[PDB]
């Protein structure tokens, strides 16, 4: 009992990677009976095959750190690795200021 064909067809139909396709470990005869794209679509409609949600990559830590940085943290002398011109080019500052004036 190999469900490689059904998994391949389900990944094609659902528009997702193999890791997000869920094939019911129970109900294996019903999935194995599905040899066409139409029958795999029927399996997806019956809940036998499910697209799983993507994993979480959360930006909450970065948002909190961005609030801290906006208040003025983490940007002192010990923190900066690039040259001052790299961090804030002198040409950009000059262009800004002359356009202002």
């Amino acid at each position: 009992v190999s469900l490689k064909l059904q998994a391949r067809l389900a990944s094609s139909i659902l528009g997702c990677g193999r890791a997000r396709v869920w094939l019911d470990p129970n109900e294996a005869v019903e999935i194995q009976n599905a040899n066409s794209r139409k029958s795999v679509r029927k399996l997806i409609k019956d809940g036998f095959i499910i697209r799983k949600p993507v994993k979480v990559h959360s930006r909450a830590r970065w948002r909190k750190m961005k609030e801290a940085k906006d208040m003025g943290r983490h940007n002192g002398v010990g923190r900066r690795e690039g040259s001052r011109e790299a961090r804030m080019p002198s040409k950009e500052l000059w262009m800004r200021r002359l356009r202002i004036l």
Binding site: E67, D70, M71, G72
Partner: protein
């Protein structure tokens, strides 16, 4: 952004308010109560206590009003609240009661919610 934020300012947060208030959010509990509850009073008490206004739990004033009419629940407020927030509060409630594994909640329409089953 325009003005630099402060940590002390984070102490007390002020919630934006709209123009013509009395904005209404409704939860519809008809289906779960149709089944075999004294749980509508539970939900109303939960929303009276654990609902946050200006960053504080409770003390809603005239701004947020909760009523339970005809086996459903209406929420009327003059603050800029998101519907997803009262959905979040409902999901917390159902996580307390252990119903969340059984009661689901969906947008039945614009401005209202509905408790359904699986």
């Amino acid at each position: 952004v325009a003005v630099r934020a402060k940590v002390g300012s984070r102490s007390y947060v002020r919630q934006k308010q709209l123009a013509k208030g009395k904005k209404v959010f409704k939860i519809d509990c008809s289906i779960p109560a149709a089944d075999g509850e004294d749980v509508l009073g539970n939900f109303e008490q939960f929303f009276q206590d654990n609902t946050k206004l200006n960053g504080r739990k409770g003390k809603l004033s005239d701004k947020v009003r909760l009523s339970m009419n005809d086996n459903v629940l209406t929420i009327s407020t003059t603050m800029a609240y998101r519907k997803k927030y009262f959905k979040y509060l409902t999901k917390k409630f159902l996580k307390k009661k252990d119903l969340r594994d059984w009661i689901r909640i969906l947008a039945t329409g614009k401005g209202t919610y509905q408790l359904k089953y699986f």
